[PDB]
Design an enzyme around this catalytic site. Structure first.
Site, PDB file in Angstrom:
ATOM      1  N   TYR A   1       5.398   5.735  -1.872  1.00 45.86           N
ATOM      2  CA  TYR A   1       4.429   6.184  -0.885  1.00 45.86           C
ATOM      3  C   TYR A   1       5.043   7.136   0.131  1.00 45.86           C
ATOM      4  CZ  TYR A   1       3.118   1.244  -2.235  1.00 45.86           C
ATOM      5  OH  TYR A   1       2.874   0.038  -2.914  1.00 45.86           O
TER       6      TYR A   1
HETATM    7  C1  SHT Z   1      -0.056   8.950   5.622  1.00 45.59           C
HETATM    8  C2  SHT Z   1       0.325   7.986   4.521  1.00 45.59           C
HETATM    9  O1  SHT Z   1       1.786   8.028   4.378  1.00 45.59           O
HETATM   10  P1  SHT Z   1       2.592   9.121   3.500  1.00 45.59           P
HETATM   11  O2  SHT Z   1       2.186  10.460   4.071  1.00 45.59           O
HETATM   12  O3  SHT Z   1       4.057   8.782   3.676  1.00 45.59           O
HETATM   13  O4  SHT Z   1       2.098   8.928   2.081  1.00 45.59           O
HETATM   14  C3  SHT Z   1      -0.170   6.565   4.848  1.00 45.59           C
HETATM   15  N1  SHT Z   1       0.677   5.526   4.270  1.00 45.59           N
HETATM   16  C4  SHT Z   1       1.241   5.586   3.037  1.00 45.59           C
HETATM   17  O5  SHT Z   1       2.458   5.660   2.878  1.00 45.59           O
HETATM   18  C5  SHT Z   1       0.379   5.520   1.975  1.00 45.59           C
HETATM   19  C6  SHT Z   1      -0.193   4.404   1.540  1.00 45.59           C
HETATM   20  C7  SHT Z   1       0.005   3.024   2.092  1.00 45.59           C
HETATM   21  C8  SHT Z   1       1.043   2.241   1.355  1.00 45.59           C
HETATM   22  C9  SHT Z   1       1.591   1.069   2.145  1.00 45.59           C
HETATM   23  C10 SHT Z   1       1.643  -0.205   1.316  1.00 45.59           C
HETATM   24  S1  SHT Z   1       2.361  -1.629   2.182  1.00 45.59           S
HETATM   25  S2  SHT Z   1       3.103  -2.741   0.670  1.00 45.59           S
HETATM   26  C11 SHT Z   1       4.551  -1.799   0.115  1.00 45.59           C
HETATM   27  C12 SHT Z   1       5.817  -2.091   0.894  1.00 45.59           C
HETATM   28  S3  SHT Z   1       7.213  -1.185   0.294  1.00 45.59           S
HETATM   29  O6  SHT Z   1       6.756  -0.405  -0.819  1.00 45.59           O
HETATM   30  O7  SHT Z   1       7.559  -0.267   1.492  1.00 45.59           O
HETATM   31  O8  SHT Z   1       8.266  -2.134   0.073  1.00 45.59           O
HETATM   32  C13 SHT Z   1      -1.637   6.396   4.406  1.00 45.59           C
HETATM   33  O9  SHT Z   1      -2.084   7.210   3.578  1.00 45.59           O
HETATM   34  O10 SHT Z   1      -2.281   5.456   4.905  1.00 45.59           O
END
Ligand code: SHT
Ligand code: ATP
Ligand code: ATP
Ligand code: MG
Ligand code: MG
Ligand code: ZN
Lengths: 442, 25, 50, 109, 521, 259
Positions: free
Chosen positions: A366
C-alpha cells in the site's frame, strides 16, 4: 521593526556571510529573491517540441495508449524550432521593453518560454501562462506549416491534450511547475506542488541549495495559506531561517559534530546546543531524576529542532548513502527528542505525523512511489506546514543511485529548464544576497 | 598434531547425537 | 452501464521488469499463469491462504 | 558433584592441558545457568568456575593452577564464565591426575 | 609528452613498509607493467595512483601533468595543452601534485580509470547495454556516438550473447568484461588495470588483451598494468618495473625485467600417486535452466554426467561461461538442479539429494565445504575471528587461536606471517592473502568433500604451488575428496588426475589431465 | 556538555528502556550464535559468497562536489555498494525483553544508517547487508534483546504478539520457524525468517527463564510492573500532550505559561 530576532547568515560551505541580520530580511514578504522566484515560477512554461512532433507524426493524441488513426500530421518542429520560437515570442509579445523570453533547449527539441508579466498583472491566477503559451504555439504551428483548417483540432490535442473534456493537461507536451488550481489539496496550496526531485534536479544535487529551495517554497506557501499570519508568522520565519538558510550555521555544525554519529547523537547535540543558547531550561526534576525541560523560547526551540531534524536526516542518509531512511529518521528523531526532554517535537507532532505518512507511502505494497515525489500538495504529506519536506531534499541529495524515482528519471526536463536561472540553481546564495540587500531598511 | 586430534575427539558436538529430534527418525 | 463502470485495464510490463531486475525474481509464463490464478481468486472477495 | 546428598563429592577429569584441568558436566542440571558471578579482574589461581549458557560448552567445570587476565579456568572469556568456588587447602594433585580419573572434594565453607 | 612523475615514495602502515623507494616516469602514451610477488605492493601502488582514501604517501609525492579548462572544467591529456577548447578559455597546462594542490583533483580524478582487483564496478541490476550506455553518458560522446560506441565495445569484449542479460546474473569473467567495457568508455588520461585479465581462460584473456591494445594505446593513453603473470606483461608493455616487498628490484625494458622474473621461480613438486577408494558422488541428468520472459532460455547446465571417487582431485576446465560455477554450486547442494538425479554416499547408503531437510541433503552438507569464486570474509572481524568465531569452531576459545595458526601455516603462511596476520582485518590484507585466508576458513572445519572454485587467479607460481602442495598433503593425510574448477593447466596436470572438460553445459569427455590437454590442443 | 538521560521512570521497565536506549550500556549477552548461522536464518545470501552490489563502489562513481554531503562518513556497505536488506522481529506481549517502539528507538539511537519501522506485531530494520549482518549478530541476536521463546526473527507471516504462549512458553508461530527440542531444552530454527526450510537446524540457545524475563522486559503489565506503579512516565506523557496542544493552539510564550 516588530521582531527583535537577529540571525547570522552562513553560506553552503559553513563560512560566515553577515551578522545581526534582521529576521524579516529573509521573509517572503520582504526578500526580493523570493519574490523573483515566485514570479518566475508563475510565468515560466516548458514546451516539448520533440514530443509534439512525435505525437503528431504517429497520431498519438489522447493520453495513455490512445491513438486516433487518420489524424496524423507530418511536420518538422525540431528542424524549425527557431522559426516557431520567433513566432511564439511575437504573438506573446506585449510591448517592446517586455520580457517575453523564448529560448531553445537541447538544440531545438524543447522550448523554455517566459510569459510577460503584463499578461499576469491582469490575471487572477497563474494559469494564464500555460493557456497563452498553448494558444501562441497553436497559432505558430498553424502558420509556419500550412496546416489545413480541419487539423487545428489535431494540433490542439497534440499541444494541450483532452483539456475541454479533462480539466488538465494530461497527454499534452506543455508543462509548468504549478498544477491546475482546481486540483489543489486546499486553498492556497498552489506553491506546495514542486516535488523533491524537481528541487534536487534544479539545484544540481547540491544538499544545502536543495534544502533552501524546498524550505523557501514551503514557507512561502504557508504565508500564502494564511497560516503564517499573526502569532504564527514568527515561528514560520524562524523555521525558514534555521531549516533552509542555515542560520547560525546550526545544520552544518550538527552534521560536523555527528560525522560518525547516529540519530541519537544528533538529538543529544541539538539538546546541548539548545541548553547552551538558553532556548530551553529545566522545568523540574522528578522523583526518578529526569529533569524536565520547558522552552524559554517556543518558536526558537521549534526552529532548533527543525535544524536538528535536517541534520539528522543528512547524517543518517550520508551514513547509508540511501534516501529510504527519511521517514524513520524524522519519526524517531521526534520520538527520541520528546521522550528524552519532555519537550514537543518539530511542529508539535505534525512532523511526526507527516513522517508516518512518508513511511506508509514509501515502504509497503500500500505504499506508492518513493521519497523523490514528495510534495506538500498531497493528502499524505500536507500535514506539516513546511517542516517535513526540506529534509527529504537532503536525503535524496545523499542517495547514491539506489532509487527507482531518481531525479534523473523524473526531472530531467525540469532541471534543464530551471537550472538556467541563478536564483533557482543556487537558491541559498541568492536568497542570502537578497536578504543582505534589505538589511538596513528594518 | 596430537593436541588437535584430542580436541577434535573431545569437543565434537555431533548434530545427530545432540539433536536426534531432527537428524534421526 | 455496469460492465463499462467496473472495467479497469492495467498494463503489466513495468511490474515484470521491476520484478526481474530490481526484485531479483524470475518472470516466466508459468509465473504469469500463477499470478492470474491468484488474482482471479482474490479479485471478487478472496483472501489467499487466510 | 553430588554434595546435595553426601558429604564428599566426585569430580571427573574431562580434558587436561598443562595448567588447565576441566571436569565433566551434567546435561540435566545445566539449564538455568544464567551469567551469575562473572570475573571483573584477572582470575587468580585455584578458582573453580562453570561456563554459563553464553558459551557453546555450557556447564563444563574447570580449574587452573595459574592466573591469566583473558581466559577463565575453562578456556572461555570472562563473560562466559561464572565463578562458583575455589580450592582452599589441598593442591598439587590436579597436576598428577590423568584424564577420566575422579577426584574427591570436601566443602569447608 | 611527459604525463606523470613518481618521486621517492615510501608508503608505511604503522612501521610496516608496504612500499619504499618507488620511482618511475610515464609519458603521454606508453604501457608499463608492474611485476612483483604476491603482496609486493602492486594494488597499493595502483590505489596510490588512483587517489583512493587511505593511500596518501608518507615520504614522497606524485605529480600529474595534464591540460585543464579553467572555467568549463575539463582536464584532458597534456597533448591538448594549447588547443582552443569547445568552451571559452583554452587548455592551460597544470602540474597537479596529488594529495596536495586541490581545485583540480575532482576533475582530474574523473579522467582516470581503474580496474579494481576482484571487485566489479557495475550497477548489477541495469543489464549490460545500460551499464555501458551510462558509462558513455557519464563523460564524452553523445546519443549516436554513445550508441555505436557501445555496440562496438560489446563486440570487443565479446558479450553479444548477453546484451539484455541482467549484469547481476552474469558470471565472473563476464562481469569483468562488462567492467572493462565501462572503464574504456570514459576517455581517460591514464588506465590503471589491476589484473585486467583476472582469473580468465587463455582465449578470453587474449580477447581482453586485444581489446586493451585496440582501445587505449590507439588513443595514446598511458596504462599502468599489473598482472604478476609474466606473459601478459611482456606482450603488452615496453617498459616494466619489478618490485619485491615494496622495493624496486629491477627497472628497465619489459623484456629484460620479465626474463629476470622467470629466473626466480621454483619448479612444481609432482606429488606421489595415491589410489582412490569407491565412487562417492553420482550425477545422472543434472540440468540448470534460467528461463525468463524477456531474454529467453539460458541453459547453464545441459545434462552433465559426473562420477567422483573418494581420495581424488577432480578438475573442471573450460571456457568462460561454460557452466563450471553452476556445476560446482550444484555439487555443494547450494543451487538445486532443474532436472536430474544427484546421490551422495555417506557410508554405505546413497542419500537422495535435491531434497531439502536434515533427513536429506543436510546429512551430506555437513561434510561439504565450498570456496566460492566470488568469496567473501567478514570485514568487520579480525582474521582470528573469521577462522574461529564466525563459523563456530568445536573447541573452547583459548585453544582456537593455536588451531587457527596451524591452519594458516598449513595453507602456506610462515609462522611469523600467521602470527602477525591473526589480529588483522581482511581490509588490511591483499587479494591473494585474503584468498588463502578463505581457503583456510574452508579447510579448518575439515569437510569430507571440498570444492575449490578457482583457488588460483591472483597468486604467484610459488604461491600457487604452495596451495597445490597444501591440497595434496590434505588429501593424502586426511582422505579428503576434492573437486577443482581452474584455468591454469599445469595446476591441473600436477594436482588433478581425472579432470573433465566443460563446454556450454556439456561434459564432452573425461580423462587424465594430459589427455584433456591434448584434446584441447 | 549535556549528559543525556534516556527515559523517565523509576520502575524496572523504565530502567530497561533506558538501558536499551543507552548506546554506552553494554547489553548482557546470553548466547553465542555464529555469524554464518545468523546469515542462514536471515535467508538473504548464502554464507561464504560475496555480497551482491546495487551500484559500483563510491570511489568508482562520480558525484558533484558537495561539502555538506561529504562531511558524513559512509558505512562500509555503502562504500562497497551492497543491496539493502532487512531483519524482522516479532515480540510477544507476555514479557518479551524487547518491544516494537523500544526496538525502533534503540536502533535509531545505537546504529548508523538504519531504517526502522514499527507495527503492533512487527518491527523491521533495513540496512546495507554487511553492516546489517554485523549488528544482527552482535546486538540483535546474541544479547538480552532476543529471547528464542517470546521473540522470533520472522518475516512473511507474523501473528501471535497478542496471543498466549504455547505449552513450552514459546510465542505462537503459524509457520513454525523455531521448535523446542525437549531432549536438550534448546530452541532450534528449522526455517529461515521468511519460511523456506533450512538444510541444518541452527541452535539459538534455550528460552530465558520467566523470572529473568520479568526483570529484563520493557513492557508494562498488570501482572508485572504496571504504569500506575510508574507515575513519572504518565506525567511526562501528559506534559508532552499538553505541550503539543498548546503549540497547536497558539505557539507563544504566553500560551505556554499554562504548561
Ligand atoms: C492515501 C493512501 O495511502 P498511499 O498513498 O500510501 O497508498 C491511503 N492508505 C493506504 O495506504 C491505502 C490503503 C489502506 C491500507 C491500510 C490497511 S491496514 S492492515 C495492513 C497493515 S501492514 O500491511 O502495514 O502490515 C488510502 O488510500 O486510504
Ligand atoms: N590498509 C593496509 N594496512 C596495512 N597493510 C596493508 C594494507 N593494505 C595492504 N597492506 C599490505 O600491503 C602489502 C601489499 O598489498 P597489495 O594489495 O598491494 O598486494 P599486491 O602486490 O597487489 O599482491 P596480490 O597479488 O596479493 O594482490 C601486503 O603485505 C598487505 O598485507
Ligand atoms: N542467476 C542467473 N540467471 C541467469 N543466468 C545466469 C545466472 N547465473 C549465471 N547465469 C549464466 O549462466 C552461464 C553459466 O554461468 P557460470 O557461472 O556457471 O559460468 P562459468 O563457466 O563458471 O564462468 P566463469 O569462467 O566466467 O567464472 C553464464 O552465461 C551466466 O551468465
Ligand atoms: Mg593485488
Ligand atoms: Mg565461474
Ligand atoms: Zn574548455
Amino acid at each position: 521593526v516588530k521582531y527583535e530576532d537577529k540571525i547570522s547568515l552562513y553560506d553552503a560551505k559553513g563560512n560566515l556571510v553577515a551578522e545581526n541580520v534582521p529576521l524579516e530580511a529573509i521573509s517572503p514578504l520582504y526578500n526580493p529573491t523570493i519574490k523573483s522566484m515566485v514570479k518566475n515560477i508563475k510565468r515560466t512554461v516548458a514546451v516539448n517540441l520533440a514530443g509534439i512532433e512525435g505525437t503528431l507524426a504517429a497520431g498519438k493524441i489522447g493520453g495513455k495508449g490512445c491513438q486516433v488513426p487518420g489524424r496524423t500530421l507530418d511536420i518538422s518542429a525540431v528542424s524549425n524550432a527557431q522559426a516557431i520560437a520567433d513566432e511564439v515570442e511575437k504573438i506573446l509579445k506585449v510591448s517592446e521593453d517586455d520580457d517575453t523570453a523564448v529560448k531553445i533547449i537541447n538544440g531545438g527539441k524543447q522550448l523554455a518560454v517566459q510569459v510577460p508579466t503584463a499578461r499576469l498583472e491582469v490575471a487572477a491566477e497563474y494559469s494564464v501562462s500555460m493557456l497563452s503559451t498553448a494558444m501562441a504555439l497553436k497559432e505558430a504551428l498553424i502558420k509556419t506549416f500550412n496546416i489545413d483548417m480541419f487539423d487545428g483540432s489535431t494540433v490542439h490535442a497534440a499541444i494541450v491534450g483532452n483539456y475541454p473534456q479533462v480539466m488538465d493537461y494530461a497527454g499534452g507536451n506543455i508543462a509548468s511547475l504549478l498544477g491546475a488550481p482546481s486540483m489543489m489539496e486546499g486553498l492556497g496550496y498552489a506553491l506546495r506542488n514542486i516535488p523533491v526531485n524537481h528541487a534536487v534536479a534544479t539545484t544540481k544535487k547540491n544538499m544545502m541549495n536543495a534544502i533552501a529551495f524546498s524550505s523557501v517554497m514551503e514557507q512561502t506557501a504557508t504565508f500564502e495559506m494564511g497560516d503564517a499570519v499573526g502569532s504564527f508568522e514568527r515561528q514560520h520565519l524562524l523555521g525558514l531561517a534555521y531549516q533552509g538558510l542555515n542560520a547560525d550555521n546550526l545544520v552544518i555544525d550538527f552534521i560536523k559534530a555527528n560525522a560518525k554519529g547516529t540519530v541519537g547523537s544528533v538529538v543529544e547535540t541539538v539538546i546541548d546546543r539548545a541548553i547552551a543558547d538558553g532556548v530551553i531550561v529545566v522545568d523540574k526534576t522528578m522523583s526518578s531524576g529526569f529533569n524536565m525541560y520547558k522552552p524559554a523560547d517556543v518558536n526558537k526551540w521549534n526552529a532548533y529542532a527543525a535544524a536538528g531534524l535536517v541534520a539528522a536526516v543528512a547524517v543518517s542518509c550520508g551514513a547509508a548513502r540511501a534516501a529510504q531512511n527519511v521517514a524513520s529518521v524524522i519519526l524517531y528523531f521526534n520520538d527520541i527528542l520528546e521522550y528524552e526532554t519532555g519537550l514537543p517535537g518539530v511542529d508539535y507532532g505534525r512532523s511526526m505525523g507527516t513522517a508516518v505518512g512518508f513511511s506508509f507511502f514509501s515502504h509497503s505494497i500500500y505504499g506508492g512511489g518513493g521519497p523523490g515525489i514528495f510534495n506538500g500538495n498531497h493528502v499524505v504529506t500536507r500535514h506539516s506546514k513546511g517542516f517535513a519536506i526540506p529534509p527529504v531534499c537532503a536525503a535524496m541529495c545523499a542517495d547514491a543511485g539506489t532509487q527507482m524515482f531518481s531525479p534523473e528519471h523524473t526531472s530531467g526536463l525540469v532541471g534543464s529548464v530551471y537550472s538556467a536561472f541563478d536564483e533557482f540553481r543556487e537558491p541559498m546564495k541568492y536568497v542570502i544576497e537578497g536578504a543582505l540587500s534589505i538589511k538596513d531598511q528594518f | 598434531r596430537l593436541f588437535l586430534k584430542a580436541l577434535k575427539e573431545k569437543f565434537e558436538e555431533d548434530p545427530k547425537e545432540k539433536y536426534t529430534k531432527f537428524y534421526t527418525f | 452501464w455496469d460492465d463499462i463502470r467496473r472495467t479497469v485495464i492495467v498494463g503489466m510490463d513495468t511490474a515484470h521488469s521491476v520484478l526481474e531486475k530490481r526484485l531479483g525474481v524470475e518472470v516466466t509464463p508459468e509465473t504469469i499463469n500463477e499470478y492470474m490464478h491468484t488474482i482471479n481468486h482474490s479479485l471478487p472477495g478472496g483472501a489467499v491462504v487466510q | 558433584t553430588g554434595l546435595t546428598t553426601k558429604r564428599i563429592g566426585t569430580l571427573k577429569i574431562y580434558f587436561k592441558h598443562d595448567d588447565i584441568s576441566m571436569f565433566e558436566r551434567d546435561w540435566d542440571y545445566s539449564k538455568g545457568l544464567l551469567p551469575e558471578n562473572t570475573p571483573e579482574k584477572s582470575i587468580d589461581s585455584g578458582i573453580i568456575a562453570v561456563t554459563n549458557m553464553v558459551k557453546k560448552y555450557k556447564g563444563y567445570i574447570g580449574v587452573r593452577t595459574s592466573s591469566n587476565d583473558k581466559y577463565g579456568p575453562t578456556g572461555e572469556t570472562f563473560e562466559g564464565t561464572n565463578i562458583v568456588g575455589k580450592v582452599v587447602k589441598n593442591s598439587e594433585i590436579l597436576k598428577s591426575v590423568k584424564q577420566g580419573e575422579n577426584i574427591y572434594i570436601l566443602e569447608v565453607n | 609528452m611527459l604525463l606523470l612523475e613518481v618521486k621517492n615514495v615510501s608508503k608505511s602502515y604503522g612501521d610496516t613498509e608496504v612500499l619504499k623507494n618507488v620511482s618511475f616516469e610515464l609519458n603521454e602514451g606508453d604501457v608499463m607493467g608492474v611485476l612483483g610477488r604476491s603482496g609486493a605492493g602492486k594494488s597499493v601502488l595502483l590505489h596510490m595512483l588512483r587517489g583512493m582514501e587511505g593511500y596518501e604517501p608518507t615520504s614522497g609525492q606524485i605529480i600529474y601533468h595534464v591540460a585543464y579548462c579553467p572555467h568549463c572544467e575539463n582536464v584532458e591529456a597534456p597533448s591538448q595543452v594549447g588547443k582552443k577548447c569547445e568552451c571559452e578559455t583554452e587548455y592551460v597546462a597544470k602540474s597537479v601534485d596529488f594529495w596536495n594542490n586541490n581545485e583540480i583533483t575532482y576533475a582530474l580524478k574523473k579522467k582516470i580509470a581503474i580496474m579494481l582487483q576482484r571487485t566489479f564496478a557495475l550497477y548489477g541490476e541495469k543489464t549490460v547495454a545500460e551499464n555501458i550506455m551510462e558509462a558513455l553518458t557519464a563523460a564524452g560522446y553523445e546519443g549516436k556516438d554513445a550508441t555505436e560506441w557501445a555496440l562496438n565495445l560489446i563486440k570487443m569484449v565479446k558479450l553479444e550473447h548477453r546484451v539484455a542479460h541482467i549484469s547481476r546474473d552474469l558470471s565472473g569473467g563476464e562481469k569483468q568484461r562488462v567492467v572493462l567495457a565501462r572503464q574504456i568508455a570514459k576517455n581517460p588520461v591514464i588506465f590503471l588495470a589491476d589484473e585486467p585479465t583476472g582469473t580468465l581462460d587463455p582465449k578470453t584473456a587474449k580477447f581482453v588483451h586485444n581489446a586493451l591494445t585496440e582501445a587505449v594505446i590507439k588513443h595514446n593513453i598511458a596504462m599502468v598494468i599489473t598482472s604478476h603473470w609474466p606473459e601478459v606483461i611482456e606482450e603488452l608493455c615496453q617498459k616494466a618495473i619489478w618490485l619485491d616487498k615494496g622495493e624496486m628490484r629491477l627497472v628497465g625494458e619489459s623484456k629484460h625485467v620479465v626474463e629476470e622474473f622467470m629466473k626466480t621461480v621454483t619448479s612444481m613438486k609432482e606429488f606421489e600417486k595415491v589410489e582412490v577408494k569407491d565412487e562417492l558422488l553420482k550425477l545422472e541428468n543434472v540440468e540448470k535452466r534460467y528461463v525468463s520472459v524477456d531474454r529467453g532460455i539460458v541453459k547453464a547446465v545441459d545434462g552433465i554426467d559426473v562420477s567422483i571417487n573418494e581420495k581424488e582431485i577432480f578438475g573442471l576446465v573450460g571456457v568462460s561461461g561454460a557452466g563450471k560455477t553452476t556445476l560446482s554450486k550444484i555439487i555443494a547442494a547450494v543451487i538445486p538442479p532443474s532436472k536430474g538425479n544427484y546421490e551422495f554416499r555417506l557410508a554405505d547408503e546413497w542419500v537422495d539429494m535435491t531434497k531439502v531437510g536434515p533427513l536429506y541433503r543436510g546429512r551430506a552438507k555437513r561434510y561439504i565445504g565450498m570456496l566460492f569464486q566470488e568469496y567473501s570474509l567478514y570485514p568487520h572481524r579480525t582474521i582470528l575471528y573469521n577462522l574461529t568465531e564466525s563459523i563456530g569452531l568445536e573447541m573452547p576459545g583459548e585453544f582456537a587461536k593455536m588451531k587457527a595458526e596451524h591452519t594458516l601455516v598449513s595453507v602456506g603462511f610462515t609462522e611469523e606471517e600467521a602470527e602477525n596476520m591473526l589480529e588483522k582485518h581482511p581490509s588490511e590484507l591483499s587479494v591473494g592473502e585474503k584468498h588463502r585466508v578463505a581457503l583456510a576458513q574452508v579447510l579448518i572445519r575439515e569437510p569430507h568433500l571440498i570444492l575449490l572454485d578457482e583457488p588460483t587467479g591472483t597468486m604467484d607460481p610459488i604461491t600457487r604451488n604452495q596451495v597445490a602442495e597444501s591440497i595434496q598433503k590434505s588429501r593424502s593425510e586426511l582422505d579428503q575428496t576434492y573437486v577443482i574448477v581452474s584455468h591454469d593447466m599445469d595446476f591441473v596436470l600436477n594436482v588433478c588426475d581425472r579432470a573433465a572438460l566443460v563446454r556450454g553445459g556439456k561434459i564432452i569427455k573425461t580423462g587424465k589431465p594430459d589427455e584433456i590437454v591434448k584434446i584441447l590442443s | 556538555a549535556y549528559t543525556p538521560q534516556f527515559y523517565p521512570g523509576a520502575t524496572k521497565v523504565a530502567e530497561n528502556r533506558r538501558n536499551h536506549l543507552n548506546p554506552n550500556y553494554e547489553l548482557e549477552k546470553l548466547r553465542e550464535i555464529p555469524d554464518e548461522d545468523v546469515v542462514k536464518i536471515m535467508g538473504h545470501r548464502q554464507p561464504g559468497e560475496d555480497y551482491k552490489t546495487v551500484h559500483p563502489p563510491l570511489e568508482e562513481m562520480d558525484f558533484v562536489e558537495d561539502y555538506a554531503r561529504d562531511l558524513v562518513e559512509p558505512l562500509n556497505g555503502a562504500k562497497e555498494g551492497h543491496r539493502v536488506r532487512y531483519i524482522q522481529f516479532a515480540d510477544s506481549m507476555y514479557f518479551a525483553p524487547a518491544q516494537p517502539y523500544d526496538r525502533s528507538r534503540s536502533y535509531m539511537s545505537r546504529l548508523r544508517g538504519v531504517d526502522a519501522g514499527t507495527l503492533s506485531g512487527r518491527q523491521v530494520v533495513e540496512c546495507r547487508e554487511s553492516d546489517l549482518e554485523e549488528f544482527s549478530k552482535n546486538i540483535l541476536m546474541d544479547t538480552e534483546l532476543f529471547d528464542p521463546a517470546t521473540s522470533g526473527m520472522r518475516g512473511a507471516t507474523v501473528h501471535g504478539h497478542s496471543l498466549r504462549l504455547d505449552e513450552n512458553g514459546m510465542m505462537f508461530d503459524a509457520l513454525q520457524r523455531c521448535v523446542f527440542d525437549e531432549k536438550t531444552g534448546h530452541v532450534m530454527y528449522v526455517k529461515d525468517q521468511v519460511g523456506k526450510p533450512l538444510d541444518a537446524p541452527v541452535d539459538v540457545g534455550e528460552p530465558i527463564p520467566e523470572a529473568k524475563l520479568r526483570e529484563i522486559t520493557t513492557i508494562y503489565r498488570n501482572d508485572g510492573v504496571a504504569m500506575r506503579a510508574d507515575p513519572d512516565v504518565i506525567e511526562v506523557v501528559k506534559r508532552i500532550h499538553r505541550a503539543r496542544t498548546l503549540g497547536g493552539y497558539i505557539p507563544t510564550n504566553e500560551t505556554f505559561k499554562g504548561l
